[PDB]
CSV table of C-alpha atoms in Angstrom, one decimal:
chain,number,residue,atom,x,y,z
A,1,UNK,CA,62.2,-24.1,128.7
A,2,UNK,CA,64.1,-21.7,131.0
A,3,UNK,CA,66.9,-22.9,133.3
A,4,UNK,CA,67.6,-20.8,136.4
A,5,UNK,CA,70.5,-21.3,138.7
A,6,UNK,CA,71.8,-18.9,141.5
A,7,UNK,CA,74.6,-18.8,144.0
A,8,UNK,CA,72.7,-19.6,147.3
A,9,UNK,CA,70.4,-18.4,150.0
A,10,UNK,CA,72.7,-18.0,152.9
A,11,UNK,CA,71.5,-15.6,155.7
A,12,UNK,CA,73.2,-12.3,156.5
A,13,UNK,CA,73.0,-9.8,159.4
A,14,UNK,CA,70.9,-6.6,158.9
A,15,UNK,CA,72.9,-4.2,156.8
A,16,UNK,CA,74.5,-6.6,154.3
A,17,UNK,CA,74.9,-7.1,150.6
A,18,UNK,CA,73.5,-9.8,148.4
A,19,UNK,CA,73.8,-10.5,144.7
A,20,UNK,CA,71.3,-12.8,142.9
A,21,UNK,CA,72.0,-14.0,139.4
A,22,UNK,CA,69.2,-15.1,137.1
A,23,UNK,CA,71.1,-16.3,134.0
A,24,UNK,CA,68.7,-18.1,131.7
A,25,UNK,CA,68.9,-20.1,128.4
A,26,UNK,CA,66.9,-20.6,125.2
A,27,UNK,CA,66.9,-18.6,121.9
A,28,UNK,CA,64.5,-15.6,122.3
A,29,UNK,CA,66.1,-13.3,124.9
A,30,UNK,CA,66.9,-10.1,123.0
A,31,UNK,CA,64.4,-7.6,124.5
A,32,UNK,CA,62.1,-8.9,127.2
A,33,UNK,CA,61.3,-7.2,130.5
A,34,UNK,CA,62.2,-9.1,133.6
A,35,UNK,CA,60.3,-8.9,136.9
A,36,UNK,CA,61.7,-9.7,140.3
A,37,UNK,CA,58.9,-11.0,142.6
A,38,UNK,CA,59.0,-12.3,146.1
A,39,UNK,CA,56.8,-14.5,148.3
A,40,UNK,CA,57.0,-14.5,152.1
A,41,UNK,CA,56.6,-17.7,154.1
A,42,UNK,CA,53.0,-18.0,155.0
A,43,UNK,CA,52.1,-15.1,152.6
A,44,UNK,CA,51.1,-14.7,149.0
A,45,UNK,CA,53.2,-13.3,146.2
A,46,UNK,CA,54.7,-9.8,146.3
A,47,UNK,CA,56.3,-8.0,143.3
A,48,UNK,CA,59.7,-6.5,144.1
A,49,UNK,CA,61.0,-4.7,141.0
A,50,UNK,CA,61.3,-4.9,137.2
A,51,UNK,CA,63.6,-3.9,134.3
A,52,UNK,CA,63.0,-3.3,130.6
A,53,UNK,CA,64.1,-5.6,127.8
A,54,UNK,CA,67.0,-3.4,126.6
A,55,UNK,CA,68.2,-2.8,130.2
A,56,UNK,CA,67.4,1.0,130.2
A,57,UNK,CA,64.2,1.3,132.1
A,58,UNK,CA,64.2,-0.2,135.6
A,59,UNK,CA,62.1,0.5,138.7
A,60,UNK,CA,61.1,-1.0,142.0
A,61,UNK,CA,58.2,-1.1,144.4
A,62,UNK,CA,57.3,1.4,147.2
A,63,UNK,CA,58.5,-0.5,150.3
A,64,UNK,CA,61.8,-1.7,148.6
A,65,UNK,CA,62.7,1.6,147.1
A,66,UNK,CA,66.2,3.0,147.8
A,67,UNK,CA,68.0,-0.2,148.9
A,68,UNK,CA,67.7,-2.5,145.9
A,69,UNK,CA,69.0,-2.4,142.3
A,70,UNK,CA,68.4,-4.6,139.2
A,71,UNK,CA,70.4,-4.8,136.0
A,72,UNK,CA,70.4,-6.9,132.8
A,73,UNK,CA,73.1,-8.2,130.6
A,74,UNK,CA,72.3,-9.0,126.9
A,75,UNK,CA,75.3,-10.7,125.1
A,76,UNK,CA,75.4,-13.2,128.0
A,77,UNK,CA,71.9,-12.4,129.1
A,78,UNK,CA,71.6,-12.4,132.9
A,79,UNK,CA,69.4,-10.7,135.5
A,80,UNK,CA,71.5,-9.3,138.4
A,81,UNK,CA,69.8,-8.2,141.6
A,82,UNK,CA,71.7,-6.3,144.3
A,83,UNK,CA,70.1,-6.1,147.7
A,84,UNK,CA,71.6,-3.8,150.4
A,85,UNK,CA,70.7,-3.1,154.0
A,86,UNK,CA,68.3,-6.0,154.4
A,87,UNK,CA,65.5,-6.0,157.0
A,88,UNK,CA,63.5,-8.6,158.9
A,89,UNK,CA,60.7,-8.5,156.2
A,90,UNK,CA,63.1,-9.5,153.3
A,91,UNK,CA,63.1,-13.1,154.4
A,92,UNK,CA,61.2,-14.7,151.5
A,93,UNK,CA,61.5,-16.8,148.4
A,94,UNK,CA,62.5,-14.7,145.4
A,95,UNK,CA,61.8,-15.5,141.7
A,96,UNK,CA,62.7,-13.8,138.4
A,97,UNK,CA,60.0,-14.0,135.7
A,98,UNK,CA,60.0,-13.2,132.0
A,99,UNK,CA,57.1,-11.6,130.0
A,100,UNK,CA,55.6,-11.5,126.5
A,101,UNK,CA,57.2,-9.9,123.4
A,102,UNK,CA,58.8,-6.5,123.4
A,103,UNK,CA,55.7,-4.5,122.3
A,104,UNK,CA,53.5,-4.9,125.4
A,105,UNK,CA,55.3,-4.4,128.7
A,106,UNK,CA,52.3,-5.0,131.1
A,107,UNK,CA,50.8,-7.9,129.2
A,108,UNK,CA,51.9,-11.5,129.1
A,109,UNK,CA,54.2,-13.5,131.4
A,110,UNK,CA,56.1,-16.7,130.5
A,111,UNK,CA,57.5,-19.4,132.8
A,112,UNK,CA,59.2,-18.0,135.9
A,113,UNK,CA,61.9,-20.5,137.0
A,114,UNK,CA,63.0,-21.7,140.4
A,115,UNK,CA,63.8,-18.9,142.8
A,116,UNK,CA,65.7,-19.1,146.1
A,117,UNK,CA,64.9,-18.6,149.7
A,118,UNK,CA,66.7,-15.6,151.4
A,119,UNK,CA,66.6,-15.4,155.2
A,120,UNK,CA,67.4,-12.4,157.4
A,121,UNK,CA,68.1,-13.3,161.1
A,122,UNK,CA,70.2,-12.0,164.0
A,123,UNK,CA,71.7,-14.6,166.2
A,124,UNK,CA,75.0,-16.5,166.8
B,1,UNK,CA,47.4,0.6,144.6
B,2,UNK,CA,45.9,-1.9,147.1
B,3,UNK,CA,46.4,-5.6,147.0
B,4,UNK,CA,43.4,-7.3,145.4
B,5,UNK,CA,41.6,-9.4,148.1
B,6,UNK,CA,41.2,-13.0,147.2
B,7,UNK,CA,38.5,-15.2,148.8
B,8,UNK,CA,39.1,-18.2,151.1
B,9,UNK,CA,40.4,-21.5,149.8
B,10,UNK,CA,37.7,-23.8,148.4
B,11,UNK,CA,37.2,-27.6,148.0
B,12,UNK,CA,35.3,-29.5,145.4
B,13,UNK,CA,34.5,-33.1,144.6
B,14,UNK,CA,35.8,-34.7,141.4
B,15,UNK,CA,33.7,-34.5,138.2
B,16,UNK,CA,32.5,-31.0,138.8
B,17,UNK,CA,33.4,-27.5,137.6
B,18,UNK,CA,34.8,-24.9,140.0
B,19,UNK,CA,34.7,-21.1,139.7
B,20,UNK,CA,37.3,-18.8,141.4
B,21,UNK,CA,36.5,-15.1,141.9
B,22,UNK,CA,39.0,-12.2,142.0
B,23,UNK,CA,37.7,-8.8,143.2
B,24,UNK,CA,39.4,-5.5,142.7
B,25,UNK,CA,40.6,-3.9,145.9
B,26,UNK,CA,40.3,-0.2,145.0
B,27,UNK,CA,39.1,1.7,142.0
B,28,UNK,CA,37.4,0.0,139.1
B,29,UNK,CA,38.3,-3.0,137.0
B,30,UNK,CA,38.7,-0.6,134.0
B,31,UNK,CA,42.4,-1.5,133.6
B,32,UNK,CA,44.7,-4.0,131.9
B,33,UNK,CA,43.7,-7.7,131.6
B,34,UNK,CA,43.9,-9.9,134.8
B,35,UNK,CA,45.6,-13.2,134.5
B,36,UNK,CA,46.0,-16.3,136.8
B,37,UNK,CA,48.7,-18.6,137.8
B,38,UNK,CA,48.9,-22.2,139.1
B,39,UNK,CA,51.4,-22.8,141.9
B,40,UNK,CA,51.6,-26.2,143.4
B,41,UNK,CA,52.7,-26.4,147.1
B,42,UNK,CA,56.5,-26.6,146.9
B,43,UNK,CA,56.5,-26.0,143.1
B,44,UNK,CA,56.9,-23.0,140.8
B,45,UNK,CA,53.9,-21.1,139.6
B,46,UNK,CA,52.6,-21.9,136.1
B,47,UNK,CA,50.5,-19.5,134.0
B,48,UNK,CA,47.0,-20.6,132.9
B,49,UNK,CA,46.8,-18.4,129.7
B,50,UNK,CA,49.7,-17.8,127.4
B,51,UNK,CA,49.1,-14.1,126.3
B,52,UNK,CA,45.5,-12.8,126.7
B,53,UNK,CA,42.7,-15.4,126.6
B,54,UNK,CA,43.5,-18.0,123.9
B,55,UNK,CA,45.0,-21.5,123.8
B,56,UNK,CA,47.7,-21.6,126.6
B,57,UNK,CA,51.0,-23.6,126.6
B,58,UNK,CA,49.4,-27.0,127.5
B,59,UNK,CA,46.0,-26.4,129.2
B,60,UNK,CA,43.6,-27.5,126.4
B,61,UNK,CA,40.2,-26.6,127.9
B,62,UNK,CA,40.5,-26.8,131.7
B,63,UNK,CA,41.1,-23.1,132.5
B,64,UNK,CA,39.0,-20.3,131.2
B,65,UNK,CA,38.9,-16.6,132.1
B,66,UNK,CA,36.1,-14.0,132.1
B,67,UNK,CA,35.4,-10.5,133.4
B,68,UNK,CA,32.1,-9.4,134.9
B,69,UNK,CA,31.4,-5.7,135.1
B,70,UNK,CA,28.2,-6.1,137.1
B,71,UNK,CA,30.2,-7.6,139.9
B,72,UNK,CA,33.4,-5.9,138.7
B,73,UNK,CA,35.6,-9.0,139.1
B,74,UNK,CA,37.5,-11.7,137.3
B,75,UNK,CA,36.2,-15.2,137.1
B,76,UNK,CA,38.4,-18.3,136.5
B,77,UNK,CA,36.4,-21.4,135.4
B,78,UNK,CA,38.1,-24.7,135.8
B,79,UNK,CA,36.3,-27.7,134.3
B,80,UNK,CA,37.4,-31.3,134.5
B,81,UNK,CA,38.7,-31.5,138.1
B,82,UNK,CA,41.8,-33.7,138.3
B,83,UNK,CA,44.3,-34.7,140.9
B,84,UNK,CA,46.8,-32.1,139.6
B,85,UNK,CA,44.3,-29.2,140.3
B,86,UNK,CA,44.5,-29.2,144.1
B,87,UNK,CA,47.0,-26.3,144.5
B,88,UNK,CA,47.3,-22.6,145.2
B,89,UNK,CA,46.2,-19.9,142.7
B,90,UNK,CA,46.8,-16.2,142.6
B,91,UNK,CA,45.2,-13.6,140.3
B,92,UNK,CA,47.8,-11.0,139.1
B,93,UNK,CA,47.3,-7.7,137.3
B,94,UNK,CA,48.8,-4.3,136.8
B,95,UNK,CA,47.8,-0.9,138.1
B,96,UNK,CA,48.0,2.6,136.6
B,97,UNK,CA,51.6,2.9,137.8
B,98,UNK,CA,53.1,-0.2,136.1
B,99,UNK,CA,53.2,-2.1,139.4
B,100,UNK,CA,52.5,-5.8,139.5
B,101,UNK,CA,49.7,-6.4,141.9
B,102,UNK,CA,48.9,-9.9,143.2
B,103,UNK,CA,46.1,-11.5,145.2
B,104,UNK,CA,45.7,-13.2,148.6
B,105,UNK,CA,45.7,-16.7,147.1
B,106,UNK,CA,43.2,-19.5,147.1
B,107,UNK,CA,43.8,-23.2,147.6
B,108,UNK,CA,41.7,-25.5,145.4
B,109,UNK,CA,41.3,-28.9,147.1
B,110,UNK,CA,40.1,-32.1,145.5
B,111,UNK,CA,38.2,-34.6,147.6
B,112,UNK,CA,39.4,-38.2,147.6
C,1,UNK,CA,74.6,7.3,136.5
C,2,UNK,CA,72.5,5.1,134.2
C,3,UNK,CA,72.7,4.0,130.5
C,4,UNK,CA,70.9,5.4,127.5
C,5,UNK,CA,67.1,5.6,127.6
C,6,UNK,CA,65.3,2.8,125.7
C,7,UNK,CA,63.2,5.3,123.8
C,8,UNK,CA,64.9,4.0,120.7
C,9,UNK,CA,62.8,0.9,121.0
C,10,UNK,CA,59.6,2.9,121.7
C,11,UNK,CA,59.5,4.7,118.4
C,12,UNK,CA,60.6,1.5,116.6
C,13,UNK,CA,58.0,-1.2,117.4
C,14,UNK,CA,56.9,-4.2,115.5
C,15,UNK,CA,53.3,-4.2,116.5
C,16,UNK,CA,51.6,-1.2,118.1
C,17,UNK,CA,48.5,-1.3,120.4
C,18,UNK,CA,44.9,-0.4,119.8
C,19,UNK,CA,42.7,2.4,121.3
C,20,UNK,CA,40.7,0.2,123.7
C,21,UNK,CA,44.0,-1.4,124.9
C,22,UNK,CA,46.9,1.1,124.8
C,23,UNK,CA,50.4,0.6,126.2
C,24,UNK,CA,51.5,2.5,129.3
C,25,UNK,CA,55.2,1.9,129.5
C,26,UNK,CA,56.7,3.5,132.5
C,27,UNK,CA,60.2,5.0,131.9
C,28,UNK,CA,62.4,6.1,134.8
C,29,UNK,CA,66.1,6.3,135.8
C,30,UNK,CA,67.5,7.1,132.3
C,31,UNK,CA,69.0,10.0,130.4
C,32,UNK,CA,67.0,12.6,128.6
C,33,UNK,CA,69.1,12.9,125.4
C,34,UNK,CA,66.7,14.4,122.8
C,35,UNK,CA,69.5,15.5,120.5
C,36,UNK,CA,68.8,12.5,118.2
C,37,UNK,CA,65.0,12.9,118.6
C,38,UNK,CA,65.2,16.6,117.5
C,39,UNK,CA,66.8,16.0,114.1
C,40,UNK,CA,64.4,13.3,113.0
C,41,UNK,CA,62.5,13.0,109.7
C,42,UNK,CA,60.1,15.8,108.8
C,43,UNK,CA,57.1,14.4,110.6
C,44,UNK,CA,53.7,16.0,110.8
C,45,UNK,CA,53.5,16.5,114.6
C,46,UNK,CA,56.4,17.6,116.9
C,47,UNK,CA,54.4,19.6,119.5
C,48,UNK,CA,55.2,19.6,123.2
C,49,UNK,CA,52.7,21.5,125.4
C,50,UNK,CA,54.7,21.3,128.6
C,51,UNK,CA,58.0,23.1,128.0
C,52,UNK,CA,60.5,23.8,125.2
C,53,UNK,CA,62.3,20.6,124.0
C,54,UNK,CA,65.6,22.5,124.2
C,55,UNK,CA,65.3,23.3,128.0
C,56,UNK,CA,63.8,19.8,128.7
C,57,UNK,CA,67.3,18.3,129.0
C,58,UNK,CA,67.9,20.4,132.2
C,59,UNK,CA,64.7,19.5,134.0
C,60,UNK,CA,64.4,16.7,136.5
C,61,UNK,CA,61.4,14.4,136.8
C,62,UNK,CA,60.3,11.6,139.1
C,63,UNK,CA,58.8,9.1,136.6
C,64,UNK,CA,57.7,9.5,133.0
C,65,UNK,CA,55.2,7.5,130.9
C,66,UNK,CA,55.0,6.5,127.2
C,67,UNK,CA,51.7,5.6,125.5
C,68,UNK,CA,51.7,4.4,121.9
C,69,UNK,CA,48.6,3.8,119.8
C,70,UNK,CA,47.3,4.1,116.2
C,71,UNK,CA,44.4,6.3,115.1
C,72,UNK,CA,43.1,7.9,111.9
C,73,UNK,CA,44.0,11.3,110.4
C,74,UNK,CA,41.0,13.3,111.7
C,75,UNK,CA,41.5,12.0,115.2
C,76,UNK,CA,45.0,13.5,115.8
C,77,UNK,CA,43.6,16.9,116.6
C,78,UNK,CA,41.4,15.4,119.4
C,79,UNK,CA,44.5,14.6,121.6
C,80,UNK,CA,44.4,17.7,123.9
C,81,UNK,CA,43.8,18.4,127.6
C,82,UNK,CA,40.1,18.9,127.2
C,83,UNK,CA,38.3,18.7,123.9
C,84,UNK,CA,35.3,17.1,122.3
C,85,UNK,CA,35.4,14.3,119.9
C,86,UNK,CA,34.6,10.6,119.2
C,87,UNK,CA,37.9,9.5,120.8
C,88,UNK,CA,38.8,12.5,122.9
C,89,UNK,CA,36.0,12.0,125.4
C,90,UNK,CA,35.0,8.4,124.8
C,91,UNK,CA,38.1,6.2,124.5
C,92,UNK,CA,41.2,8.3,125.0
C,93,UNK,CA,41.0,11.3,127.4
C,94,UNK,CA,43.7,13.3,129.2
C,95,UNK,CA,43.2,15.6,132.3
C,96,UNK,CA,44.3,19.2,132.5
C,97,UNK,CA,47.9,18.5,133.5
C,98,UNK,CA,49.6,16.9,130.5
C,99,UNK,CA,53.1,18.5,130.2
C,100,UNK,CA,54.6,16.1,127.6
C,101,UNK,CA,54.6,15.8,123.8
C,102,UNK,CA,52.1,14.6,121.2
C,103,UNK,CA,54.7,13.4,118.7
C,104,UNK,CA,53.1,11.3,116.0
C,105,UNK,CA,54.0,10.0,112.5
C,106,UNK,CA,52.3,8.3,109.6
C,107,UNK,CA,53.3,4.7,108.7
C,108,UNK,CA,51.2,4.1,105.6
C,109,UNK,CA,54.2,2.9,103.5
C,110,UNK,CA,54.8,-0.6,104.8
C,111,UNK,CA,51.2,-1.6,105.5
C,112,UNK,CA,50.2,-1.8,101.8
C,113,UNK,CA,48.4,-5.1,102.1
C,114,UNK,CA,44.8,-5.3,100.6
C,115,UNK,CA,43.5,-8.1,102.7
C,116,UNK,CA,41.3,-6.6,105.4
C,117,UNK,CA,42.8,-4.7,108.3
C,118,UNK,CA,40.5,-6.4,110.9
C,119,UNK,CA,43.1,-6.2,113.7
C,120,UNK,CA,42.7,-2.7,115.1
C,121,UNK,CA,39.5,-1.1,116.6
C,122,UNK,CA,38.6,1.8,118.8
C,123,UNK,CA,35.3,0.7,120.4
C,124,UNK,CA,33.1,3.5,119.3
C,125,UNK,CA,30.3,2.4,121.7
C,126,UNK,CA,31.0,3.2,125.4
C,127,UNK,CA,29.3,4.7,128.5
C,128,UNK,CA,32.2,6.7,130.0
C,129,UNK,CA,31.4,10.1,131.5
C,130,UNK,CA,34.2,10.7,134.1
C,131,UNK,CA,37.6,9.2,135.1
C,132,UNK,CA,39.5,10.3,132.0
C,133,UNK,CA,41.6,7.0,132.4
C,134,UNK,CA,38.5,4.8,132.1
C,135,UNK,CA,39.9,2.1,129.8
C,136,UNK,CA,38.1,-1.0,128.6
C,137,UNK,CA,39.5,-4.5,127.8
C,138,UNK,CA,36.6,-6.9,128.0
C,139,UNK,CA,34.3,-7.9,125.1
C,140,UNK,CA,30.9,-7.1,126.5
C,141,UNK,CA,28.0,-5.7,124.5
C,142,UNK,CA,26.8,-2.1,124.3
C,143,UNK,CA,23.9,-1.7,126.8
C,144,UNK,CA,22.7,0.6,129.6
C,145,UNK,CA,20.3,-1.7,131.4
C,146,UNK,CA,16.5,-1.9,130.9
C,147,UNK,CA,16.4,-5.7,130.0
C,148,UNK,CA,19.6,-5.9,128.0
C,149,UNK,CA,20.0,-8.3,125.1
C,150,UNK,CA,21.1,-11.9,125.5
C,151,UNK,CA,21.7,-13.1,121.9
C,152,UNK,CA,23.9,-12.8,118.8
C,153,UNK,CA,21.5,-11.2,116.2
C,154,UNK,CA,20.4,-8.3,118.4
C,155,UNK,CA,18.6,-5.6,116.2
C,156,UNK,CA,18.2,-3.6,119.4
C,157,UNK,CA,21.8,-3.9,120.7
C,158,UNK,CA,25.1,-4.0,118.9
C,159,UNK,CA,28.6,-5.4,119.2
C,160,UNK,CA,30.8,-2.6,120.4
C,161,UNK,CA,33.9,-3.5,118.3
C,162,UNK,CA,34.2,-1.5,115.1
C,163,UNK,CA,37.4,-2.3,113.3
C,164,UNK,CA,39.2,0.0,110.9
C,165,UNK,CA,39.2,-0.2,107.1
C,166,UNK,CA,42.7,1.1,106.3
C,167,UNK,CA,43.3,0.5,102.6
C,168,UNK,CA,46.3,1.8,100.5
C,169,UNK,CA,44.0,3.2,97.8
C,170,UNK,CA,42.7,6.1,99.9
C,171,UNK,CA,43.5,9.8,100.3
C,172,UNK,CA,44.5,12.2,103.0
C,173,UNK,CA,42.5,12.8,106.1
C,174,UNK,CA,41.6,9.1,106.6
C,175,UNK,CA,45.2,7.7,106.9
C,176,UNK,CA,46.7,5.7,109.8
C,177,UNK,CA,48.9,7.6,112.2
C,178,UNK,CA,50.9,6.1,115.1
C,179,UNK,CA,50.8,8.5,118.0
C,180,UNK,CA,53.1,8.3,121.0
C,181,UNK,CA,52.6,10.6,124.0
C,182,UNK,CA,54.7,11.1,127.1
C,183,UNK,CA,52.7,11.6,130.3
C,184,UNK,CA,54.6,13.5,133.0
C,185,UNK,CA,53.8,13.6,136.7
C,186,UNK,CA,55.6,14.7,139.9
C,187,UNK,CA,54.8,13.3,143.4
C,188,UNK,CA,56.4,13.4,146.8
C,189,UNK,CA,59.4,11.3,145.7
C,190,UNK,CA,63.0,12.0,144.7
C,191,UNK,CA,63.5,12.6,141.0
C,192,UNK,CA,65.1,10.0,138.8
C,193,UNK,CA,65.3,11.3,135.2
C,194,UNK,CA,67.0,14.7,134.8
C,195,UNK,CA,68.9,14.6,131.5
C,196,UNK,CA,72.5,15.3,130.6
C,197,UNK,CA,73.7,18.7,131.9
């Protein structure tokens, strides 16, 4: 019940910029925390970052702290993720997941979506 | 804190009930509830319980969850093995720092 | 740098948590604008043990926390860094480092429904001795070994879920109070929340 479309998953050289858009649909999207998660090829899931429902509170993980930002738009609700200075470990499939209602922030998780594969290589 | 270790993938014959264990990596299980997800190979993960432990969004009685303090681990019981059950599963929870911790993953296989 | 802090949604919630399961919302990278929070309604608790609320706007912090729950009247005093009580050392304990606030308020004006308030409970029965953050979310039975019970009747064991009996036709002292505390901590990491200077 949640449509997720992004721009693409084109590779980039180490030390680049990438913007991922997670615009969704539906009717209940006023105040719901959004979690950016990643999954490496040949590896399990790995949480990247999260943002509150109102767009005020936002934080990230330990290994991806300092080079990634996440924002949320409400009137045209959309989850924006800015990734700068990528490394060799950032090549993974990224997803953006919802959660339960606004009261509990660490309890409940709705359908995630589709996600996209971002690769970081260095060649011609 | 530490990624919760998940046991090796398992296989089961149809017509039986399987049990998946999820052991806490560090500390104790005295934290928020632990949930599960169903991710088919090449598909998006789907949750097995809607909010805490009650009727999910389309799994009538197949998936059930429990917590064992004697072993200090989560237990996912899957009854009525079907062809759509052979897939990867991950147990996800939260720590004392509002970080989303996942598991190593377990592939449930159905014998044909 | 950032937008307004979402604290406006913390003090205005549609359904708060219980004592056995309490919210732990992590707040970071916002503005500490307590000018609106200072001139609020005449509540019954506006105490901050850490520092003065006036000088708090000029103090940087790495990450802050917000824990909201609902207790009775006689249980508000038990929220302190080290104190005895049925909730202070059994269900909700704080170490000797809390530098936040204990802001709380009564909400017995809109909950006037005489139908049985069997939704909130505090799990009086427990076996916690250390680890002040020893929470509990399961639905086990109160036991300590020695051939525990395995039935429903019991008569030697008991179901460790005692719900409240909040009714509008009561007096002071046994009234519901929503308490929201702000846990502060500083580690080896750059600060995020500082407040408007």
